[PDB]
Design a protein around this ligand. Structure first.
Ligand SMILES: [Cl-]
Ligand SMILES: [Cl-]
Ligand SMILES: [Cl-]
Ligand SMILES: [Cl-]
Ligand SMILES: [Cl-]
Ligand SMILES: [Cl-]
Ligand SMILES: [Cl-]
Ligand SMILES: [Cl-]
Ligand SMILES: [Cl-]
Ligand SMILES: [Cl-]
Ligand SMILES: [Cl-]
Ligand SMILES: [Cl-]
Ligand SMILES: [Cl-]
Ligand SMILES: [Cl-]
Ligand SMILES: [Cl-]
Ligand SMILES: [Cl-]
Ligand SMILES: [Cl-]
Ligand SMILES: [Cl-]
Ligand SMILES: [Cl-]
Ligand SMILES: [Cl-]
Ligand SMILES: [Cl-]
Ligand SMILES: [Cl-]
Ligand SMILES: [Cl-]
Ligand SMILES: [Cl-]
Ligand SMILES: [Cl-]
Ligand SMILES: [Cl-]
Ligand SMILES: [Cl-]
Ligand SMILES: [Cl-]
Ligand SMILES: [Cl-]
Ligand SMILES: [Cl-]
Ligand SMILES: [Cl-]
Ligand SMILES: [Cl-]
Ligand SMILES: [Fe+2]
Ligand SMILES: [Fe+2]
Ligand SMILES: [Fe+2]
Ligand SMILES: [Fe+2]
Ligand SMILES: [Fe+2]
Ligand SMILES: [Fe+2]
Ligand SMILES: [Fe+2]
Ligand SMILES: [Fe+2]
Ligand SMILES: [Fe+2]
Ligand SMILES: [Fe+2]
Ligand SMILES: [Fe+2]
Ligand SMILES: [Fe+2]
Ligand SMILES: [Fe+2]
Ligand SMILES: [Fe+2]
Ligand SMILES: [Fe+2]
Ligand SMILES: [Fe+2]
Ligand SMILES: [Fe+2]
Ligand SMILES: [Fe+2]
Ligand SMILES: [Fe+2]
Ligand SMILES: [Fe+2]
Ligand SMILES: [Fe+2]
Ligand SMILES: [Fe+2]
Ligand SMILES: [Fe+2]
Ligand SMILES: [Fe+2]
Ligand SMILES: [Fe+2]
Ligand SMILES: [Fe+2]
Ligand SMILES: [Fe+2]
Ligand SMILES: [Fe+2]
Ligand SMILES: [Fe+2]
Ligand SMILES: [Fe+2]
Ligand SMILES: [Fe+2]
Ligand SMILES: [Fe+2]
Ligand SMILES: [Fe+2]
Ligand SMILES: [Fe+2]
Ligand SMILES: [Fe+2]
Ligand SMILES: [Fe+2]
Ligand SMILES: [Fe+2]
Ligand SMILES: [Fe+2]
Ligand SMILES: [Fe+2]
Ligand SMILES: [Fe+2]
Ligand SMILES: [Fe+2]
Ligand SMILES: [Fe+2]
Ligand SMILES: [Fe+2]
Ligand SMILES: [Fe+2]
Ligand SMILES: [Fe+2]
Ligand SMILES: [Fe+2]
Ligand SMILES: [Fe+2]
Ligand SMILES: [Fe+2]
Ligand SMILES: [Mg+2]
Ligand SMILES: [Mg+2]
Ligand SMILES: [Mg+2]
Ligand SMILES: [Mg+2]
Ligand SMILES: [Mg+2]
Ligand SMILES: [Mg+2]
Ligand SMILES: [Mg+2]
Ligand SMILES: [Mg+2]
Ligand SMILES: [Mg+2]
Ligand SMILES: [Mg+2]
Ligand SMILES: [Mg+2]
Ligand SMILES: [Mg+2]
Ligand SMILES: [Mg+2]
Ligand SMILES: [Mg+2]
Ligand SMILES: [Mg+2]
Ligand SMILES: [Mg+2]
Ligand SMILES: [Mg+2]
Ligand SMILES: [Mg+2]
Lengths: 173, 173, 173, 173, 173, 173
């Protein structure tokens, strides 16, 4: 107290990083739920399953990089419960994509608030960390999900019988 | 009488294995019938044909492993007629998949009854044999057929003109 | 009705091909029975087992080529029960070989009657099919079985203790 | 309702599998917490960190295989909150190892109760699943942790200055 | 007391595993005795020698896997004298094969009793261990020895001068 | 009677070789016991385990070469019970090493007495056999064990917490 490594690292930043870790672990859990929805016998869209499983594992990576940052800067990781997702039954490929898009925008908003806090606290290391590893990743993710939602809507998902099947095999395959 | 190899092998188990051999050979014949239905000039779904031909050959493997078990344990194989399948004309890709699912559940029920008999007779070798080579294979097969039935139903098979054609080329291809 | 592919294909030929399919599947089953007789603990002639298992699989090939022919010509496959073999206990390597020789001659006679029918119906495609894929195969098979029976008889099978053992390891190995 | 795949799968088993999924995800989170404790600047045992991170990822694998089983059998995954671990500060390499050993024994007890339930419900597929993928894994894990605890105790951890350092570099390296 | 690893492991099971270790070491010694009988100048059947030496080494493997199990589960290995085999002079290749068959059936009976005890004590780990590594190995071994005894009897062993010589060179070579 | 191969081979030598075979098999069993002591969860010195397991297998080799010698010279192998080791709990790495050193010196004394007997009986083949394959092996083994005991004593085994751990990983690893 303080850590021999700690320098220019505000307690508010440390707390906000702990909250961000929880949010990234939550996002991982949401995607894991979606992945296994798509492998149900009455859904059986294996490339939607693979896509969301990959997203789940990326969110765990996002959480771990923040945990590493906490240690690097001499903060102390404080974990909290990972809340269950809002749904187990995700309804359709389109609905899951729309929910993922909303999730990603929510996580983006949290990251932008974290960047504003880091700026306020004169922490350019933390600002750069977020810019380098988080903000463009989020923009790319949101854009990709937007593209997917548009194609599924235009194709007639979820009610048009061929739409999710064909998107599964040609876009996500 | 008895075989110099026979040990802890109840006559009821020996008889039940003979009945299971017949059922696996019957399942092989059903799938062979389906395979050649799909190669008719007025059906011509070559990947449905290939899929069911593969399933036919797997069922022969299942029969042979039970025949080998009978010899290994010192029982005597007693073959019976292999009954013809219930249909020659299987109507559609969806109908064949639904019939295959029912067949697999029926074969599964027979295997579960065989496991219950082996348990009752204190035959852990036979229990393990069924668990190792049959029960999970059946669960996997039933799940795969369930997945296929769901996709074909959602796509609008059998009446939607593109459904079986597209499933043939993208899932079974 | 008729199939858009059907041409110069008599209903009698179509029916005779269905009967031939059943006979080839029956021959496969006979050989499968023999194969597993030779793997009994009280018989244990592993190369006799392998030899008859191979013959079993070849007969399934013979059945499938006729099933393909039926579809190619626009006929409709009509499957029937596959009758069990005449024996489960095949007595000896010599007896099995003698039974196989009789089976092959019986199947040959059926093929010759099928060729006579095809000739009568002016079906040169069917005549050529039988000549190309069946008649010489049968002559080769009958000759091979004749050779095997002669050697086993001369060697003193089944009662001479070394005969089947030595034939198993030097001719069939 | 029910799933077209469901067979011999009791609702109690389905519920117990959902509880087991939560427990495996909890174990993953415990190990993740431990991994990042060991990377603190005031702990800095990088091979303890790597060891627990690996264990964390294995527990996620354990959770996923149960999620797959639920879908395979036609049950429905029902996720719950993942509770935070009991500690963020794990005190020492020895204490973390002792906590991991207790966790593994607790998870083992849950698996044994699940196997007893599956047995009671006559579900040999579920029994075999647990035996094949879970029970021996748990015994191996408990034994390994026991070995590690013994060596650390004998070496004088946590107070002997060289003990955890040397164990980190020679056993876990 | 108890071992920090021990869980769901009954003292009766621990004792029965110690007895099984002794029996497997005894079986190894029997086979070692047989191997060196066949290398006598007045026996000189080098492939019978090699066959039994291999079986001896496999039995040591069986003993070691049980010793490892004892440690894995937190039991304590308690070794006893390894009794000498019943004979040094094994009389003939046929007699040795018949003695080996009886030995294997006796060891199998002991394993089945061990499985019944494990079942009674609700130890699915131990049941699976026996099923996975012991019970099918025993069935395979008994069947192989049955096959060998049958061929040697039919060939006229031990009195027919060529029988053991030819079996040595063609089956065991 | 006598063996057609026997020449210059005294009955006393034949008997002494049988006693030596038993002693080498006993030494193998002692080392096997030690190997599995070191794999206990409350000992867990895996390189001590590996070292003694290797020594166990070498002693079996020593026994087999004497069994081969007996046959080569036309003597008859006479096996006896293999007595259990003096301990199951070997107390420590140092104590096991000290017990192994005493065992090796005892086996050496027996070999020297065997050489004296062979000399007395004018058997230069047996003298050379012992010199070539046994006497220098024993001197090397005794020296190696002496080296190990010295290092463990100097390092402070068994009570110094780091000693056996460090010797396990740097000398025996
Ligand atoms: Cl600071
Ligand atoms: Cl809350
Ligand atoms: Cl700044
Ligand atoms: Cl897209
Ligand atoms: Cl559509
Ligand atoms: Cl029996
Ligand atoms: Cl009937
Ligand atoms: Cl049982
Ligand atoms: Cl599908
Ligand atoms: Cl359509
Ligand atoms: Cl398409
Ligand atoms: Cl026509
Ligand atoms: Cl009839
Ligand atoms: Cl013509
Ligand atoms: Cl021939
Ligand atoms: Cl003869
Ligand atoms: Cl059910
Ligand atoms: Cl709660
Ligand atoms: Cl059950
Ligand atoms: Cl360790
Ligand atoms: Cl220290
Ligand atoms: Cl216990
Ligand atoms: Cl006694
Ligand atoms: Cl149990
Ligand atoms: Cl044999
Ligand atoms: Cl002879
Ligand atoms: Cl020969
Ligand atoms: Cl002499
Ligand atoms: Cl005594
Ligand atoms: Cl001399
Ligand atoms: Cl040394
Ligand atoms: Cl020390
Ligand atoms: Fe939050
Ligand atoms: Fe992504
Ligand atoms: Fe990625
Ligand atoms: Fe993220
Ligand atoms: Fe909640
Ligand atoms: Fe994200
Ligand atoms: Fe930048
Ligand atoms: Fe992303
Ligand atoms: Fe039946
Ligand atoms: Fe399949
Ligand atoms: Fe396959
Ligand atoms: Fe099957
Ligand atoms: Fe019928
Ligand atoms: Fe099947
Ligand atoms: Fe079981
Ligand atoms: Fe299958
Ligand atoms: Fe017929
Ligand atoms: Fe052939
Ligand atoms: Fe062939
Ligand atoms: Fe044929
Ligand atoms: Fe009949
Ligand atoms: Fe034929
Ligand atoms: Fe021709
Ligand atoms: Fe042929
Ligand atoms: Fe729980
Ligand atoms: Fe692990
Ligand atoms: Fe691993
Ligand atoms: Fe786990
Ligand atoms: Fe809480
Ligand atoms: Fe675990
Ligand atoms: Fe199993
Ligand atoms: Fe583990
Ligand atoms: Fe015993
Ligand atoms: Fe073997
Ligand atoms: Fe082997
Ligand atoms: Fe054994
Ligand atoms: Fe005795
Ligand atoms: Fe054995
Ligand atoms: Fe064996
Ligand atoms: Fe002695
Ligand atoms: Fe050595
Ligand atoms: Fe060596
Ligand atoms: Fe030795
Ligand atoms: Fe004693
Ligand atoms: Fe030695
Ligand atoms: Fe020399
Ligand atoms: Fe040595
Ligand atoms: Fe070192
Ligand atoms: Mg300082
Ligand atoms: Mg603070
Ligand atoms: Mg998938
Ligand atoms: Mg007998
Ligand atoms: Mg009977
Ligand atoms: Mg085709
Ligand atoms: Mg037309
Ligand atoms: Mg007609
Ligand atoms: Mg075979
Ligand atoms: Mg339905
Ligand atoms: Mg329910
Ligand atoms: Mg690290
Ligand atoms: Mg304790
Ligand atoms: Mg006790
Ligand atoms: Mg040899
Ligand atoms: Mg003479
Ligand atoms: Mg004498
Ligand atoms: Mg080891």
């Amino acid at each position: 107290g303080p850590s021999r490594v700690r320098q220019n690292f505000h307690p508010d930043s440390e707390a906000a990083i702990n909250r961000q870790i929880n949010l990234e672990l939550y996002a991982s859990y949401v995607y894991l739920s979606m992945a296994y929805y798509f492998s149900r016998d009455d859904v059986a869209l294996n490339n939607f399953s693979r896509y969301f499983l990959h997203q789940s594992r990326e969110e765990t990576e996002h959480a771990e990089k923040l945990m590493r940052l906490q240690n690097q800067r001499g903060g102390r990781i404080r974990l909290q419960d990972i809340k269950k997702p809002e749904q187990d039954d995700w309804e359709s490929g389109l609905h899951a994509m729309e929910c993922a898009l909303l999730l990603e925008k929510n996580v983006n908003q949290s990251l932008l608030e974290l960047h504003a806090l880091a700026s306020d606290k004169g922490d350019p290391h933390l600002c750069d960390f977020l810019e380098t590893y988080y903000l463009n990743e989020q923009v790319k993710s949101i854009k990709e999900l937007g593209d997917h939602v548009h194609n599924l809507v235009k194709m007639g998902a979820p009610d048009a019988g061929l739409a999710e099947y064909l998107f599964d095999t040609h876009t996500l395959g």
